[PDB]
């Protein structure tokens, strides 16, 4: 179940966020902690491609090796709040599961700057969801969270100390696949 209406950053800069580069999840927190494994890897590319707002999302259980790529044209609810009906694809963009109305996440950017971000998502796969999931992002795979994003976690009335780190999972990312998936 999702329970939060996350507030987007006032003055969110969409061109900077959706610039075609990769964001790495460095830390995450699910309000239903059993919905996501304690050890998990994720990254996303966010861009505009041929005038469509796009995201390509990767996730990987580092212990089971299960690997997933999703691709979505986003639809806009408000500046910094999006609905992403996704298709499951291989790393090359080949469709494995077509878009279908019930398979979507919402995506809210609570804080962003040039190097870091805090997002909330609510995933739906049919009648089931993955809970409220918050993620700290960085442009650099190994970056410890800085004061700006940690303060944004506090501003959301969350405790960064409770976030789970992804840094000890031996995560590796196909950056090239993520970027090229934006076009698919």
From Swiss-Prot:
**Annotated residues for binding of heme:** 59
Cofactor(s) demanded: heme b
Report the domain of life of the source organism: Eukaryota
Q: What is its EC number?
A: 1.7.6.1
**Keyword Transmembrane helix, does the record have it?**
no
| Subcellular localization(s) per the UniProt record | Secreted
Gene3D superfamilies in the record, alphabetically?
2.40.128.20
| Annotated tissue distribution | Salivary gland (at protein level).
Q: Name one GO biological process term.
A: vasodilation
* Effect recorded for residue 130 to R: Coordination of the heme iron center and inhibition of nitrite disproportionation
Outcome of mutating residue 121 to V: No effect on NO-induced conformational change or on pH dependence for NO release. Increased NO association rates
What does it do?
Heme-based protein that delivers nitric oxide gas (NO) to the victim while feeding, resulting in vasodilation and inhibition of platelet aggregation. Reversibly binds nitric oxide (NO). Also binds tightly to histamine, which is released by the host to induce wound healing. NO release is pH dependent and linked to loop dynamics.
Kindly provide the name given to this protein in its UniProt entry.
Answer: Nitrophorin-4
What species does this protein belong to?
Answer: Rhodnius prolixus (Triatomid bug)
């Amino acid at each position: 179940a999702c329970t939060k209406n996350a507030i987007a950053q006032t003055g969110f800069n969409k061109d900077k966020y959706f610039n075609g580069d990769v964001w790495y999840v460095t830390d995450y927190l699910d309000l239903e902690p059993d919905d996501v494994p304690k050890r998990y890897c994720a990254a996303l590319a966010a861009g505009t491609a041929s005038g469509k707002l796009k995201e390509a999302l990767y996730h990987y259980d580092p212990k089971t090796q299960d690997t997933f790529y999703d691709v979505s044209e986003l639809q806009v609810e408000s500046l910094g709040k999006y609905t992403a009906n996704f298709k499951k694809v291989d790393k090359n963009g080949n469709v494995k599961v077509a878009v279908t109305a019930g398979n979507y996440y919402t995506f809210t950017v609570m804080y962003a700057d040039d190097s870091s971000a805090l997002i909330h998502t609510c995933l739906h796969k049919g009648n089931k969801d993955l809970g409220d999931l918050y993620a700290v992002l960085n442009r650099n795979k190994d970056a410890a969270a800085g004061d700006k994003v940690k303060s944004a976690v506090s501003a959301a009335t969350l405790e960064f100390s409770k976030f789970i780190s992804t840094k000890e999972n031996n995560c590796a990312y196909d950056n090239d696949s993520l970027k090229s998936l934006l076009t698919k």
